[PDB]
Amino acid sequence: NLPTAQEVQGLMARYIELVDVGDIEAIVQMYADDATVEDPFGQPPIHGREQIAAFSRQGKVRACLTGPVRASHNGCGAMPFRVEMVWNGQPCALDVIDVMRFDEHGRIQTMQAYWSEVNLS
Amino acid sequence: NLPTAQEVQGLMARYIELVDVGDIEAIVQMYADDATVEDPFGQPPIHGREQIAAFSRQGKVRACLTGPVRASHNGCGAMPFRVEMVWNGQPCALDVIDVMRFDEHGRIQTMQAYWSEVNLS
């Protein structure tokens, strides 16, 4: 576990903070070297920092926290946020919620994004 | 899985319609007899429609959805909601995030809630 509920909220808030300013470098540093990521949740996961840096690098998108971050007592958290993009010259929003679990060193050991087309406005 | 993206949205937003009113018997009917519930996430789990029945009644109270349900394609969902109450003569909100998987029959086969004091206002 390690990170306290109040810490999770801190970490998770920042993660959406780096995603906005587009700091591919910093995000990947919050992840564990052997962290996993299913996004859209369900889909096969991309494990490890390089693969996690490939997707992150691969996909003018702005991120926003639409609600408080829900932190648990065992190092987990979940936050509501929304990504504004542009469907090829067609400004579209995406509502997402990320469910992260941190390790004893305060690193995202796993992340799962919940979203689909029904969340695309 | 089974319930499509749109289906799952409704079933989830349906669940919050029942908590707000207070219908415990309809609530305990979405859950499959074998379902389990981790609430708050990080706690030992509660197995059986039976025990969830005891827990439901266990907790004046109105749950409002705070934003879209994030729905996947493998019969899963995630939603942000607030739960107003008055803890010991002092009103107080609770911002929670529930994640639930539905089996083929559209019954909540598994559920986990994300909250803690850091989300009580």
Instruction: Report resolution (Å) to 1 decimal.
Output: 2.2
Question: How big is chain A by its Cα radius of gyration, in Å?
Answer: 14
Do A116 and B71 lie within an 8 Å CB cutoff? yes
* DSSP 8-state class, residue A39: S
Distance CA B85, CA B62 (A): 7
Cα nearest neighbour of B98 on chain A = A78
**Residue B15 is among the residues annotated as catalytic for this protein:** yes
- Main-chain phi, psi angles of A70, to 5 degrees: -90, 100
- Structural determination approach: X-ray
Q: Round to whole Å and give the CA distance between B56 and B108.
A: 14
User: What tokens were used for A44?
Assistant: 């096969």
Q: What ranges in A1-121 are assigned the alpha helix state H? A: 5-20, 24-27, 49-58
Residues of B in contact with A42 (CB under 8 A): 72-74, 76
- Between 3.10.450.50, 1.20.1370.20, 3.20.20.150, 1.10.12.10, what CATH number should domain A1-121 receive? 3.10.450.50
* Phi, psi at B28, each rounded to 5°: -65, 10
3-state secondary structure of A13: helix
Q: How is chain B classified by DSSP, letter by letter?
A: --S-HHHHHHHHHHHHHHHHHT-HHHHTTTEEEEEEEESSTTSPPEEHHHHHHHHHHH---EEEE-SPPEE-SSSEEEEEEEEEEEETTEEE-BEEEEEEEE-TTS-EEEEEE---GGGB-
Domain boundaries, chain A: 1-121
The answer for residues whose C-beta is within 8 angstroms of residue A121's C-beta and 6 or more apart is A92, A93, A94, A95
| Sole residue written with tokens 């579209």 | A92
A114 three-state secondary structure: strand
Under 8 Å between Cβ of A103 and A1: no
